Curated annotation (Swiss-Prot), chains B, D:
This is Caspase-8 subunit p18. The chain holds residues 223 to 371 of 479 of the full protein. The modification Phosphotyrosine is found at Y112. It comes from Homo sapiens. The modification N6-acetyllysine is found at K2. Changing C138S: Abolishes interaction with UBR2. The active site is at H95, C138.
Length: 90, 149, 90, 149
């Protein structure tokens, strides 16, 4: 038969690049997860793949800010996926 | 383009490790004397539940887990038979630091230690199938600066 | 004006996941780079974005093997890109 | 979907750090007494050159660089004016280990130390523009095992 790498087909979605904080609004949820779910709900029905959706999450979260500290948040996906990943609604 | 098969019902399991209470950490780990509970985290767990159930996944929530408890949960799913599933998702909501996430007890769990439990060799029934991990936690104490565009 | 994260818009293409080796054939070049260029040459003219192309590279490299050690290689991209990235030929 | 602007001619610079001769490493670093030269690496440099010139990038090759020499080269491009460019690419071809790449002298260069030189604050003329890094090197000495599918 055919063989592929032991660590193939993984998708790791980090809320932030290393060394930095990720935000949580106690009355709304976290910047990353809330953005992730909104993007998934809106785009999966359209057939968009996860990498495209996570790119949109990067865009959305990058536009948010923490005034109190002039802070930002940069999500960061890492993957060993070998094919397009979609979550059909049907 | 080639696309992963995603037609099974359910698509597979969607684990949600939701840590809120860090009382043990504040009492056991000296440098975590003031780590605060993660108020509002249930809003994330609820959104993930709704979103992925809508996407046909079977949700498996686990609240307030120490590091040892997290490894136990992952072991259960590593040994489980995912033959009839097309995908596997694991969501971690907790505090964290560089390359790790904290258990409610303040102990550290390397991210690699979490994802590596589901490699093709360790979980054959998921071989060739997408394994997705979403990690909501800090990865350090630095504020990411902004740039004008 | 608007502000985005300091570490936004990065794309890191690693020839292999951490802890493991990457291969180089002295008479052909490395598995990763040779696959990367072949995919870029073939797909950029088609309008495919870099994430889609790197996914194909993951697929291609995952099918190669080192008999002498029964070894494999798993490339791994990481990104903070906020938009689709394409390299037009025109 | 939103797409990065990519219409400038050239698109931008494509650096190629191509390390082949590791004689210094074999003589200076004890544990690298037997590290071998990277024969065939020129085939990679040539393919990258052809591929990206075809994609309208200006190629900037640099052969056999020690770690100090690599940082010097990156500093030059960090301080350069990329205002008229729409993208920046940096290709590293060398030996490496966990999270690092080796200079021809056997010294280590953390990957983060390389990419961080081009953040929006450090290189304003590239703010909002894609910065692409391709790293061809080992990230450890372990053989990645295979799984049947």
């Amino acid at each position: 038969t055919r063989y592929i790498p032991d660590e193939a087909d993984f998708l790791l979605g980090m809320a932030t690049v290393n060394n930095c904080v990720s935000y949580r609004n106690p009355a709304e949820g976290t910047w990353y997860i809330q953005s992730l779910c909104q993007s998934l709900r809106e785009r999966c029905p359209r057939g968009d793949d996860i990498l495209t959706i996570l790119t949109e999450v990067n865009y959305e979260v990058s536009n948010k800010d923490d005034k109190k500290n002039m802070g930002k948040q940069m999500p960061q996906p890492t993957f060993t996926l070998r094919k397009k990943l979609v979550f059909p609604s049907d | 383009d080639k696309v992963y098969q995603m037609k099974s019902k359910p698509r597979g399991y969607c684990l949600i490790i939701n840590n809120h209470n860090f009382a043990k950490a504040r009492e056991k780990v000296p440098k975590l004397h003031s780590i605060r509970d993660r108020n509002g985290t249930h809003l994330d767990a609820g959104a993930l539940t709704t979103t992925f159930e809508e996407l046909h996944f079977e949700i498996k929530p686990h609240d307030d887990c120490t590091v040892e408890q997290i490894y136990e949960i992952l072991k259960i799913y590593q040994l489980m038979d995912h033959s009839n599933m097309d995908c596997f998702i694991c969501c971690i909501l907790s505090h964290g630091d560089k390359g790790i996430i904290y258990g409610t007890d303040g102990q550290e769990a390397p991210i690699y230690e979490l994802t590596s439990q589901f490699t093709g060799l360790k979980c054959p029934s998921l071989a060739g199938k997408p394994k997705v991990f979403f990690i909501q936690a800090c990865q350090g104490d630095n504020y990411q600066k902004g740039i004008p565009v």
